[PDB]
Amino acid sequence: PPQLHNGLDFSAKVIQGSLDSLPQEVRKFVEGNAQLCQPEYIHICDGSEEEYGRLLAHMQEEGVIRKLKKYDNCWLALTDPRDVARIESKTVIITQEQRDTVPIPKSGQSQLGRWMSEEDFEKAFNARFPGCMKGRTMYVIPFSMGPLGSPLAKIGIELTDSPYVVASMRIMTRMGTSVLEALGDGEFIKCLHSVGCPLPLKKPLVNNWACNPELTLIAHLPDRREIISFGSGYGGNSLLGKKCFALRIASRLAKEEGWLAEHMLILGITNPEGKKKYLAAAFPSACGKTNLAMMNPTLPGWKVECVGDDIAWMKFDAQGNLRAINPENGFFGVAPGTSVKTNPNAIKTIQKNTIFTNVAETSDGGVYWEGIDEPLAPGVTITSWKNKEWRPQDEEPCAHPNSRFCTPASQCPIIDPAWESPEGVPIEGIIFGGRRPAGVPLVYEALSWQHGVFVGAAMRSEGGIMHDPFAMRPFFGYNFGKYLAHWLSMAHRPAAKLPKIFHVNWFRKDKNGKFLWPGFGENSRVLEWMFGRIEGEDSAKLTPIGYVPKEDALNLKGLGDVNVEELFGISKEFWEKEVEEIDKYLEDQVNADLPYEIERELRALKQRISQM
């Protein structure tokens, strides 16, 4: 009799599964947080189809989702307009020393992370979590990041009061009983989440979407293997396996253990000769990873296949190959801009078993968003994401710009045969890229590994303004300076077969703000060039910024009107500005934690530019 009364025994409140079936430390995790959060019910997720349909029915009954009648088992959730995206300002990492998490900025304001003390977090935690799940179900999500059972997979337990989180996590991860069995008495990442709206409600509910914007806080405690998230039900704030776990926690572990957790798509590309290579590409959010990951190549005889569109875990094998796996189980893709033109393969994926968030609904029960490129029949009407009637004449979009689809990976018609291989896929090329409207040509190749890493460090998003090194600005699990040092150390691994490093720019514009490159499926012409360069073809011309394609090295047939002078042009004047800017940025944001080799590469680039 380990108790004097009932104890912390929550058995009486279990409505799915059994606490007795849980590994000991898992049970402890549940009951400790049950005591803190005070849920009315505990639901231990098994991951079955039966559970999933019952969950969707419950949410349908609760008014939390709408069935999209035009498609097969597709659903729509509409959110509070205050809870529409992963929120960087409320995202923090707790460590003993600030500098372990983020370099100390000379300006006194860091773009590379957001550190919170243990003391401050404890106060914030205590002001948020006690009784937060009152009147709600605590769902227990046992999930594997990476192929189930594999020793490279990592397991988490997410406790959440959101059924929307459960349904999405079932798509985005491998979840259920088999995960608990794979876990045994092993280590797991502790993931705690609440929408922060205990019953009875204190503030009004908008669009049946529970959230607490004012108290929204997404915290990480890597030393405790803990992710603790409050107040948002949206994407990266709530699906804790994705950014919180597979990037922030995992990059820190990767640093300690000799691997890599990165914001990268993984694709397999096959040339007309049937030769296949795998490539990894880091672009910032909103810069087109998912379009490339799922590309339909315009060039005949070329094939692209998707391993993953968002997150990559990578490490060397015994033979020196950099091996990559997608730790996700689905795609959580931006809906607006998705079309037959921009992503035909996504269009084919998302018509069954898919959850949409903040897109518009058509009167015949279908989905709509800006950039969909499909006219509707006259008479068909649109309900916006704000649940109002909508006309193309309105002063606002029918879908939120960050509206999403959530879709099973295995459903993708071009999903790669090896997308679940526990040994991972051999990466032969790493592609960096972002939005650079000026100065940066379509593609270049790095001069060396060290130059490659410098190229990643100098990536940009948002109109070529915001620095987003390695597409990881909001995702570093630790000090950026040390992350660079970790990337640089890869060149010292004996027999390491280092991938070639490229930088792309789909976004160069002319003087009128017109895109100089067609992009999307046409980016196959760029990947072809990369493929050949990996094969060691004599197709490259040396410049101050790296190797670029020679004249006529790129297949431009079918695009005879491309302004090649402007697209591939390199200006001494522009690049002088570029180095000066990178210098100020690294001085301000990285300073004492900058590895010497990065300083050297900045000097080397400046040097080559001075000889123009």
Ligand SMILES: Nc1nc2c(ncn2[C@@H]2O[C@H](COP(=O)(O)OP(=O)(O)OP(=O)(O)O)[C@@H](O)[C@H]2O)c(=O)[nH]1
């Ligand atoms: N001009 C141009 N735009 C592109 C191309 N590929 C993608 N885009 C744009 O990039 C945006 C879509 O990419 P997203 O799905 O938002 O980016 P992502 O990297 O998948 O972002 P997350 O899913 O948030 O990580 C849209 O604005 C597209 O128009 C291209 O080849 N050319």
Ligand SMILES: O=C(O)C(=O)CS(=O)(=O)O
């Ligand atoms: O912002 C991103 O990079 C995303 O992939 C969406 S979310 O998972 O952070 O919501």
Ligand SMILES: [Mn+2]
């Ligand atoms: Mn009810």
Ligand SMILES: [Mn+2]
């Ligand atoms: Mn994406």
Ligand SMILES: [Mn+2]
């Ligand atoms: Mn992303």
Ligand code: NA
């Ligand atoms: Na809703």
